[PDB]
């Protein structure tokens, strides 16, 4: 009403608006794309004082690392060096590759790997079509009886 | 002619999924199907040695069900009764600075070897960059 | 640690001059102001702190 809250629309109108707003609201549509970029990974990177390649950088949260216990535990004599352990692993599985994680959030893990397909060129192509992308893969009833 | 091609593919597609075919024939048939997703990017490379307006584009519109002529007879023999030289080193002197200054900054030698390798000097000059360092 | 302390020291003195006037603007204080020898009318301060520090 005149008070102007609670809108309700029909389908083709929404089709028109979604069509118009493409220069702005165009964006990615899989949870999977975001991956390490979602909040929880930023909250981790802040808590652990690491950085994702494109992520922001904060102050340490636990600026004191400087206390040290000098012990045979992690000595280079005893370590098998086969992999880098790049910081994306520290953020990806924070409780394993990391030690002493504090104020860390669980990262969310995985999504289904969306296969979603639409062709944007010809509006006059049908809705149901087999996309180029896809791999190639005694008795009777009465008449008038048909599908529902 | 996207649509006619598309139609052909649909017909070609129709055979593979719901039809029985010789194994050797089918696999080749499938592979073309694979390429369509691939896009032919090992099938568009060659000898385009006339510009699209320098080919006076006599695109001959034959159909492979005409009856045509093929004039074999024209393959007989017959009987036709019918600029400043630069003596300055100013181009070079600028490149003695650049090195010498990279070199007179930089504690140690491993961080002055970072800088030089970070310039990506051309192989032409790399001969004469050693001349400066010496 | 000696190199780190150099980098702090040199910036702290340059800050001494800057706060001495009233600016931290880089644009006002190009490195010629600190690094030209006194014979041309600068401070002639001798910079060991630019470098690159092995990390």
């Amino acid at each position: 009403g005149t008070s102007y809250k609670k809108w309700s629309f029909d389908l083709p109108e929404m089709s028109n608006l979604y069509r118009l707003s493409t220069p702005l609201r165009d964006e990615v549509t899989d949870k999977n794309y975001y991956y390490l970029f979602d909040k929880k990974s930023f909250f981790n990177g802040k808590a652990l004082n690491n950085a994702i390649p494109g992520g922001p950088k904060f102050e340490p949260l636990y600026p004191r690392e400087e206390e040290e216990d000098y012990n045979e535990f992690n000595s280079i004599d005893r370590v098998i060096f086969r992999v880098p352990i790049r910081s994306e692993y520290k953020v990806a599985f924070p409780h394993l590759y990391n030690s002493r994680p504090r104020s860390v959030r669980i990262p969310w893990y995985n999504n289904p790997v969306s296969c979603i397909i639409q062709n944007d060129e010809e509006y006059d192509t049908p809705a149901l079509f087999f996309d180029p992308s896809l791999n190639p893969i005694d008795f009777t009833l009465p008449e008038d009886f048909a599908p529902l | 002619s996207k649509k006619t091609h598309d139609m052909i593919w649909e017909k070609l597609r129709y055979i593979l999924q719901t039809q029985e075919l010789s194994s050797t024939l089918r696999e080749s048939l499938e592979t073309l199907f694979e390429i369509r997703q691939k896009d032919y990017k090992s099938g568009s490379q060659g000898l385009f040695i006339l510009d699209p307006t320098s080919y006076t584009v006599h695109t001959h519109s034959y159909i492979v069900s005409d009856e045509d002529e093929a004039n074999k007879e024209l393959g007989n023999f017959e009987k036709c009764e019918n600029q400043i030289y630069d003596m300055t080193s100013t181009n070079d002197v600028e490149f003695k600075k650049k090195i010498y200054l990279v070199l007179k900054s930089s504690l140690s030698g491993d961080e002055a070897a970072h800088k030089l390798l970070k310039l990506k000097i051309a192989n032409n000059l790399k001969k004469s960059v050693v001349d400066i360092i010496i | 640690p000696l190199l780190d302390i150099l980098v702090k020291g040199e910036t702290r003195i340059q800050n001494r001059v800057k706060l001495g006037l009233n600016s931290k603007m880089p644009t006002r204080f190009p490195p010629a102001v600190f690094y030209t020898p006194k014979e041309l009318g600068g401070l002639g301060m001798i910079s060991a702190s630019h470098i690159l520090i092995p990390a």
Partner: peptide, 27 residues
């Protein structure tokens, strides 16, 4: 990425904190 190198952060630093890999020392 921060792979154990650079600083906790550049605040007390006096520098920008820009870390770059060394071309000289690899092999």
């Amino acid at each position: 990425s921060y792979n154990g190198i650079g600083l906790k952060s550049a605040k007390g630093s006096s520098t920008s904190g820009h870390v770059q890999r060394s071309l000289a020392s690899n092999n």
